[PDB]
Design a protein around this ligand. Structure first.
Ligand SMILES: Nc1nc2c(ncn2[C@@H]2O[C@H](COP(=O)(O)OP(=O)(O)O)[C@@H](O)[C@H]2O)c(=O)[nH]1
Lengths: 663, 369, 497, 35, 47, 370, 35
């Protein structure tokens, strides 16, 4: 989330919302675009400084082309420059005696030795970009024509220095293949030099003849020299070198002479990169001798996900380094990460050729992704099945099994009303096991994963703080799962299950005590009408909470997991199911929850007065509940009209069925 | 938590025993109380399986049946018999209550039409004093008979927390309109289906109403108004079921409004039209409720037994039941004018009149106080 | 002998007499002028800005090498007159080439056009082979670019020399050779690019070009109809937007009009009435039936006959180009009017049901009012049939057999334009739209008065009869000044005046 | 000119449910700063 | 400012801007944001 | 909106059985009420497949038919029979109505040829108005002590049924004798069942116009007193052939005079291009006469034929020439009156029908209004 | 309802998203800097 920083920081640097300004960029975004340079350059053009200092940047292979286009646009609008200038100001404040006929043979024969790399009798090399000296006194025509043939010798000097230097072990395997690939090219040139050496003895190798002969070699040496300078002047290794070769090859797409040479060099130097890609795609093994691949690994402890909520593991185990992208696999970069990530988790539990204008490897990696995704899905569905575990967590955290719970409160009612830090965990755990054995929960293969825990904060204030930014209520459940399952069921999603349970448990518990009051007074007269409207509210919110939010969304999830494609969509669907469920609850609303919690506080304290066995308090209780309920109805009526939400409309219809509370 | 069933009289024993065969058939248990192999909560009605029933000349016919190994005409005479067998009957009751894990309710099935009538009236009086914190459920059956009915009704209306009316006049009506029977052996067949589905959410675990206590406080707001009817449409979606139950001929009854309606949706309907069915019935205004206090209608879902198609049962508590009591009142006056202290019937006459006044005034906008 | 001196001027080397009787100086002067153009051309065409200019330079250098090959080949040593006569028919041609070049000068497509006009200027003369050879080797980069879209379609640009440079997705600018192919080539490149993301007779160029262009265009059209169900959208679009589908037209209209402010405009109610209506449609519940949205463009504060409400279809990327935004907007416009037509049928049926419950009470007053309703009904029904026939049946007969890439775009605009023309929504038929709106207002007034006010009802009917007569008069006068409107008078008038 | 009025329901419910998800992240991480 | 950021900065001054602003511009372009959107950002922001 | 049909008498049961057989064959429904593998909406006539049919000797033969799985002689005697069984019959009527989501009309196929169906039909119409005031009722009456029963039921028909379609046997047998050369009941009822299916072509298949029964009936009926219809079906080829062939006296099934409203249904795939050209040709040659007072027009609608089962065509119209048949019945009444508990209602039936016959004859004059 | 409040309402919800997202960014580097 760096773009949101850039807009705010730019908002502070200059003087002026930012919300719309970032939406122009979010919809626009590993891909790199290119634009015309000649049109932009002439548009800019003291401009003279721009024209010579530009050539250095492209030599360094520097994210260059998009910015240059931006300067051309800024130059068109003069007011932008004036404001930028104003903002900048504000912030700142012996051939001479030898026949001319026979000197041609001597000149051409000595020019034959400098090609090999050895200094000649007349044409020598000035010690260190290589420069040469021919003669201090020679005919003007001869010197000028030799100077035309001179640069091929300098190009040979550069390439032979490049291959000798780039043979080190500290430059990556891709550099080794590139250096080795061109070793045959210089060898063939030397053979042609030797062949012309054997031809020169017959006298049929003239100065003009050599100039025509070296023309195919002149381009070959020039392109090799340019590649040598580009690699040398900018540190290129791994995918960076491959990108440079690919970009250079695509540049010479209208010559048909310099394209085959670049194609062969790229396809010969891509073997080290493609060979290690094969094991990274088909398997989960990365050798990675030097930081040259596009995937890197950070060491993180596995138990971190179960221990806490904040630390990411799915997005931190493997990340893309952008500098090393080969520039022709960026559109499938994310799929390649999925292939290795999917295979890595399942391996520990139980051929590619470079082509031009062809996407054979693109199709190859896609079906490899399909197989890797398919094998992972059936791995977690056939054995260590996901659906049964989700049905199990729904049984306890979501109170699917009512027989289990109805016995639990009836057994631990006296030990949960005591104040906090006064009940030991073992006595609760023993009661938990006894209730589970007595109830119909014995038919649960995974019944041994429920643990009692007590939170330090109450639900209402915790929800109030997270939106504005003890006793029995401290009770909470927890669950434990193994590593292959824990990847999607983690603390990031589990904390929503227990947060939902807390409100579910509080509403269920208060209804049980309220229902128990009905039998206490079952044989002074105004408490009956209060109870009727009182109980019909808690049940109505319970029914809406349970039979229109819990089941319909869960059945959607059950149908949704039957057509999964990859675990990425599985986790997205699961976090979608939880998030929409909380929205459909009465939570996630500050004004709505505060009046609801105030009403629930009225609920619990009224029942405490009944067992005390006064006439001046029942009317006060009635006037408090009616005013709270009327305020409650007003808020949801407003919230369901201005904002679209069928749940709030349902509860309004469910709470009142006779047109009462018409005010 | 456990419930012990009690059967009294010829009619009561027959209905309870017939209900027991239906439950045994639905569950995976043999008639000899042995589990058959061929999920569902069974601690409510079974003990590790000996049924928890206290059988009290029908018993002679029962003991010959294959389920054997599984286990006068005056109200005053019945009362005297109950008083004299006081020790005999309560000995079995006490020896069962202690053995239970936690008593929560009683099941009483009988007919207010001889020996069971007097025994039932006396039993409820003693249970309230002996056990004042235990729920009592009476599955009364309706048919000399004027005085017997009102004397029983006096005890039932104030000593039984719940009551379900099952009259033979309505039973024969459906038995002729939809079954064409023209016998007692066939009218009770519908009763068994109603009885089996009456507590289907208690036996089968569910989201809500897993305990008996929660199934009364939702329907019965005050101890005076404690009468629940029955309904059964299947003799197709939830909306079709909802409309058919409210139809006047379907209800088991031989201005006016409802109080609280409980519906059990036995079908396998997906829980997505359970809400819009309530939405459409509200728009059409198929029925009305009390105008003074808020009233709500609720529906519950369950599943069939796989060992054994959509069903539905309705719990109706309407003020229209005053017609049946007024019918008993009018015949009592005719019998009184045509013929120890003979004062008990006077107390029964006044108390039911207060119930009629309470029932009729329950529809007024100012029923409170 | 001076033969070596004269022969060493056309090569370019200097001589003793050539720096950088007595009439012989004139002869050497003519030969010197023959060599100076050669030297100027060599100095001008030495570089090996534009790709087309480079090819022309290469051709010129190739020609010059032949000229150098021809000289110093035949004559060892001849007479001075002989060499002058021999280099006469060729020296003038060399001067002409010098005049053709600079010794400013265009580049890109302009240079190709300039050379082409030069060839036609002197076609009959002996310069045709030279000019044709240069033009053949100067169009090589252009031919490579043309073959690029035909086979690959990956756009290539060197210095913007071409006349062509680089949601709607069609912002590729476009603005001699025959104009019948320039536009075809320009649209051919876009079509293949779109599919990637989902005598001077020019016969050698168009011979392998027409066949491939036809093949690509036919493949593009076939792909849209078969694997994208484009025709399926049109039949589904007509069902919903044009409100042709029964039991959905009535259901949507009935639910909205049952209510009639702060209601009927919140997202809760109007987004749900569409959802409820789909099940009652019985023709839908498919991915086609999705993307229907009830959009609103105006919020009235509060007898009236106006109720603004839109209905916009939504499409994905591949078909966003075929269906224009303006076409969808006009669908809403015709839908808004057509929904207003259905407002009578709901209201008229309601008052028909309202009068039904009145029935004992049979006299002159009751029967007289009911005859008015029948007269009111017949006018609405007769014009509703005209709208249905003209828009949904005869217009839909076209564009169904018409279809069997740019063809789709032109045809769709014509189909809608005819639909809105026959629907009387055009501004040319404004008086017809105005007079019917008075009838629209009058009938709702009759609806408002649901026998305490019989005189008001009689006055309203008499006003309608005068207005209806005026409608017949205005439409009759408009026939002289629209073949579509001719059918309207036959519908409204039949055995009457 | 005029909003779709149907995606508005989908757009408003996506941002609000996302904001609560984002709100729940800042609080569980801020308490880690305190702890 | 990094050497590369200063390296790009010198051409911007040569062609004819605040160094901290320019660093943000380079950062946005590094994150694959198209140059055309960035100008429309500036145009609506510098008005 | 579900629509429920009722059959009365042996004639009504016979035509109703043939109507159901043809309608079932039109859709992809087997005779055993099971859909076969083989757009159309069968929900209006069929309910989840069973037909909403109610039938009141002949029934035994009907059950013997392969379509089994698809389910006195005086007016006073017929009235008495209905009274004794009114509650039993209305029990199945009400439960079917409650089972239906929203009933629209009540299709009836009853005969007034001296049978008990006329007596039952009179009672059913009386109670349907009494109990269902907001529910439309329509009956397809058929015409032949016979003169008596043929006019007593007319008293109730003219004040209870909202719409009425008449199919007399005078023209039915003429068509059968001419174009079929029959010289039986099934041979003559098959043509009637063909009209029955084609009458509701726009109802079974969705369309833009006339999506419900009240839509069609309202146009043809100007006054509830004038609630009579006649039908024709010339299929026994462009739009002009269908329109022209639907006006000759040989096709109208009725034994000055002018039309009031014309609604015609075309079930073919004929091109809509030539529909208006046919309309102009009809007006120019003047094959039809309309009312002089109010502007009366002609309307035509198109619908798609069933692909499971050729251009069809049906006409629905109201003609003042229907008054001739009533005058024949009244004349037979007066002749039979003098030839042979108080005979009071029997008189008022004559008065009411004589009031109707006056209204028909008064609608031809140019001053019918006021 | 004003047909203009919708623009204001959408902006307010988007404000609650952008501003809260910014505070996340600032606090992330605090965790990185603290360690
Ligand atoms: N509905 C119904 N009622 C029954 C059945 N069996 C008995 N009864 C009723 O029970 C009454 C007879 O009660 P009775 O056994 O004589 O009472 P007791 O002498 O005190 O035991 C009759 O009036 C019947 O109405 C039955 O199977 N179904």
């Amino acid at each position: 989330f760096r773009i949101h920083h850039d807009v705010n920081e730019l908002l502070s640097l200059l003087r002026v919302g930012a919300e719309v300004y970032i939406d122009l960029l979010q919809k626009n975004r590993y891909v790199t675009t290119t634009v015309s340079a000649h049109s932009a350059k002439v548009k800019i053009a003291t401009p003279e400084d721009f024209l010579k200092k530009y050539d250095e940047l492209k030599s360094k292979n520097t994210n260059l082309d998009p910015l240059v286009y931006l300067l051309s646009k800024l130059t068109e609008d003069k007011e932008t420059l004036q404001y930028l200038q104003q903002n900048a100001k504000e912030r700142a404040e012996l051939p001479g005696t030898l026949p001319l006929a026979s000197q041609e043979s001597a000149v051409v024969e000595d020019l034959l030795y400098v090609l090999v790399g050895v200094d000649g009798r007349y044409v020598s090399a000035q010690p260190l970009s290589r420069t040469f000296l021919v003669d201090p006194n020679l005919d003007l025509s001869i010197r000028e024509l030799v100077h035309r043939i001179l640069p091929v010798a300098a190009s040979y000097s550069a390439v032979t220095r490049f291959i000798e230097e780039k043979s080190s072990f500290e430059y990556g395997q891709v550099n080794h293949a590139l250096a080795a690939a061109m070793r045959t090219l210089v060898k063939e040139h030397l053979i042609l030099v030797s062949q012309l050496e054997q031809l020169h003895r017959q006298g049929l190798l003239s100065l003009q003849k050599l100039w025509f002969y070296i023309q195919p070699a002149m381009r070959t040496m020039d392109i090799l020299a340019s590649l040598a300078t580009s690699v040398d002047k900018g540190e290129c290794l791994g995918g960076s070198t491959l990108s440079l070769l690919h970009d250079r090859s695509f540049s010479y797409t209208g010559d048909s002479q310099a394209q085959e040479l670049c194609l062969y060099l790229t396809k010969a130097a891509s073997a080290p990169y493609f060979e290690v890609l094969e094991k990274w795609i088909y398997r989960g093994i990365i050798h990675d001798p030097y930081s040259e691949f596009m995937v890197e690994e950070h060491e993180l402890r596995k138990e971190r996900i179960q221990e806490d909520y904040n630390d990411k593991y799915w997005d931190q185990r493997y990340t893309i380094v952008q500098q090393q992208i080969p520039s022709f696999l960026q559109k499938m970069a994310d799929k390649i990460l999925s292939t290795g990530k999917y295979l890595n988790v399942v391996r520990e539990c139980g051929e590619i050729i470079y082509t031009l204008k062809e996407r054979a490897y693109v199709e190859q990696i896609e079906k490899a992704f399909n197989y890797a995704s398919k094998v992972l899905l059936d791995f977690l569905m056939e054995e260590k099945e996901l659906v049964a575990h989700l049905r199990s967590i729904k049984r306890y955290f979501l109170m699917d099994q009512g027989d289990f719970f109805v016995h639990f409160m009836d057994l631990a009612e006296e030990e949960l009303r005591k104040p906090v830090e006064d009940i030991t965990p073992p006595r609760l755990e023993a009661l938990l096991e006894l209730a589970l054995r007595m109830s119909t929960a014995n038919t649960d293969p995974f019944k041994d994963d429920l643990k009692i825990d007590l939170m330090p904060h109450d639900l209402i204030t915790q929800l109030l703080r997270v939106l504005a930014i003890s006793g029995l209520e401290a009770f909470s459940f927890d669950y434990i799962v193994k590593w292959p399952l824990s990847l999607i069921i983690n603390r990031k999603a589990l904390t929503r299950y227990q947060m939902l349970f807390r409100h579910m448990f509080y509403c269920k518990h208060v209804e049980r005590q309220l229902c128990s009051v009905w039998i206490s007074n079952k044989t002074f007269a105004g408490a009956f009408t209060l109870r009727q409207r009182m109980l019909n509210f808690v049940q109505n919110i319970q029914y809406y909470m349970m039979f229109e939010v819990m089941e319909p969304t869960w059945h959607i999830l059950e149908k949704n997991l039957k057509s999964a494609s990859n675990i990425d969509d599985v986790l997205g669907h699961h976090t979608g199911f939880l998030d929409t469920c909380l929205k459909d609850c009465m939570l996630t609303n500050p004004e709505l929850l505060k009046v609801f919690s105030k009403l629930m506080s009225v609920c619990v304290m009224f029942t405490n007065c009944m067992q005390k066995f006064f006439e001046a308090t029942i009317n006060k209780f009635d006037k408090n509940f009616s005013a709270h309920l009327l305020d409650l109805l007003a808020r949801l009526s407003i919230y369901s009209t201005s904002d679209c939400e069928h749940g709030m409309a349902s509860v309004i219809s469910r709470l009142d069925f006779n047109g009462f509370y018409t005010e | 938590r456990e419930i012990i069933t009690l059967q009294l009289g010829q009619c009561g024993n027959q209905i309870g025993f017939e209900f027991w065969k239906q439950l045994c058939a639905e569950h995976g248990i043999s008639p000899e109380a042995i589990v058959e192999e061929f999920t569902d909560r069974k601690d409510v009605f079974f003990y590790q399986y000996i049924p928890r029933a206290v059988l009290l000349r029908v018993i002679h016919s029962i003991l010959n049946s294959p389920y054997a190994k599984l286990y006068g005409n005056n109200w005053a005479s019945g009362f005297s018999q109950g008083e004299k067998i006081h020790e005999d009957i309560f000995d079995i009751i006490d020896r069962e209550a202690d053995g239970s894990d936690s008593l929560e309710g009683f099941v009483l099935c009988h007919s207010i039409a001889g020996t069971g009538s007097g025994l039932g009236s006396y039993l409820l009086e003693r249970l309230n004093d002996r056990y004042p914190k235990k729920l009592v459920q009476t599955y009364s059956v309706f048919p000399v008979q004027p005085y017997n009915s009102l004397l029983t009704l006096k005890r039932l209306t104030q000593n039984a927390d719940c009551l379900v009316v099952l009259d033979n006049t309505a039973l024969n009506r459906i038995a002729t309109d939809r079954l064409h029977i023209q016998s007692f052996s066939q009218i009770n067949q519908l009763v068994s289906t109603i009885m089996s589905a009456s507590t289907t959410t208690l036996r089968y675990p569910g989201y809500m109403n897993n305990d008996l206590i929660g199934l009364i406080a939702s329907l019965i707001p005050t101890p005076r108004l404690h009468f629940l009817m029955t309904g059964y449409t299947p003799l197709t979606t939830v909306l079709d079921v909802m409309r058919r139950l409210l139809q006047p001929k379907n209800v088991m009854v031989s201005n006016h409004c409802y109080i609280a309606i409980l519906n059990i949706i036995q079908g396998e309907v997906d829980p997505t039209q359970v809400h819009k069915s309530l939405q459409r019935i509200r728009e059409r205004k198929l029925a009305n409720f009390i105008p003074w206090g808020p009233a709500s209608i609720q529906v519950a879902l369950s599943r069939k037994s796989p060992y054994l198609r959509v069903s539905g049962l309705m719990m109706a508590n309407h003020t229209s039941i005053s017609s049946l009591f007024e019918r008993t009142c009018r015949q009592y006056d005719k019998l009184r004018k045509r013929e120890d202290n003979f004062d008990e019937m006077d107390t029964s006459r006044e108390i039911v009149q207060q119930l009629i006044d309470e029932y009729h005034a329950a529809t007024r906008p100012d029923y409170i106080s | 002998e001076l033969v070596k001196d004269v022969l060493n001027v056309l090569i370019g080397v200097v001589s003793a007499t050539f720096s950088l009787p007595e009439s012989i100086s004139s002869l050497l002067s003519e030969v010197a002028e023959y060599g100076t153009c050669y030297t100027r051309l060599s100095h001008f065409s030495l570089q090996p800005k534009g790709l087309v200019f480079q090819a022309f330079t290469s051709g010129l250098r190739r020609y010059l090498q032949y000229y150098r090959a021809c000289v110093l080949s035949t004559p060892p040593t001849l007479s001075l007159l002989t060499i002058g006569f021999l280099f006469k028919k060729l020296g003038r041609q060399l001067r002409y080439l010098a005049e053709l070049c600079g010794v400013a000068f265009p580049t890109g497509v302009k240079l190709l056009s300039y050379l082409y006009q030069e060839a036609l200027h002197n076609c009959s003369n002996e310069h045709y082979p030279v000019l044709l050879s240069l033009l053949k080797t100067s169009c090589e980069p252009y031919t490579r670019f043309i073959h690029d879209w035909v086979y690959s379609g990956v756009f290539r640009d060197a210095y913007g020399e071409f006349m062509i440079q680089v949601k709607l997705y069609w912002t590729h600018g476009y603005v001699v050779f025959l104009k019948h192919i320039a536009h075809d080539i320009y649209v051919c490149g876009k079509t293949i690019n779109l599919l990637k993301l989902c005598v001077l007779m020019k016969r050698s160029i168009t011979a392998p070009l027409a066949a491939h262009i036809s093949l690509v265009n036919k493949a593009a059209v076939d792909y849209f109809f078969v694997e994208l169900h484009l025709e399926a959208h049109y039949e589904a679009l007509r069902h919903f937007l044009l409100m042709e589908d029964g039991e959905f037209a009535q259901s949507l209209s009935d639910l909205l009009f049952e209510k009639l402010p702060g209601e009927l405009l919140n997202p809760l109610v109007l987004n749900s009435v569409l959802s409820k209506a789909l099940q009652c449609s019985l023709h839908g519940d498919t991915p086609h039936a999705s993307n229907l949205s009830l959009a609103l463009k105006y919020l009235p504060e509060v007898p009236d006959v106006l109720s603004c409400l839109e209905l916009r279809y939504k499409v994905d990327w591949p078909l966003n180009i075929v269906i224009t935004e303006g076409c969808v907007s006009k669908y809403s416009g015709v839908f808004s009017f057509l929904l207003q037509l259905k407002l009578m049928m709901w209201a008229l049926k309601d008052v028909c049901f309202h009068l039904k419950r009145t029935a004992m009470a049979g006299s002159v007053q009751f029967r007289q009012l009911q005859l008015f309703k029948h007269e009111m009904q017949h006018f609405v029904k007769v014009i509703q049939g005209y709208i249905a026939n003209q828009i949904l049946h005869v217009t839909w007969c076209e564009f169904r057999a018409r279809l069997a890439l740019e063809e789709i775009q032109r045809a769709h605009a014509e189909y809608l334009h005819k639909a809105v023309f026959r629907g009387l929504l055009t501004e040319k038929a404004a008086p017809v739209m105005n007079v019917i709106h008075s009838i629209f207002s009058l009938v709702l007034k009759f609806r408002s008065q649901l026998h305490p006010n019989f005189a008001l009802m009689q006055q309203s009917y008499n006003t309608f009869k005068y207005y209806s007569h005026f409608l017949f008069k205005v439409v009759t006068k408009l026939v002289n000044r629209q073949p579509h409107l001719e059918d309207f008078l036959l519908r409204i008038n039949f055995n009457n005046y | 000119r005029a909003r779709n009025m149907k995606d508005f329901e989908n757009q408003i419910t996506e941002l609000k449910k996302e904001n609560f998800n984002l709100k729940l992240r800042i609080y569980f991480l801020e308490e880690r700063m305190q702890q | 400012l990094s050497t590369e950021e200063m390296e790009l900065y010198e051409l911007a001054q040569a062609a004819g801007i605040d160094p901290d602003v320019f660093k943000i511009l380079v950062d946005l372009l590094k994150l694959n944001v198209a140059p055309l959107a960035v100008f429309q950002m500036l145009k609506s922001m510098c008005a």
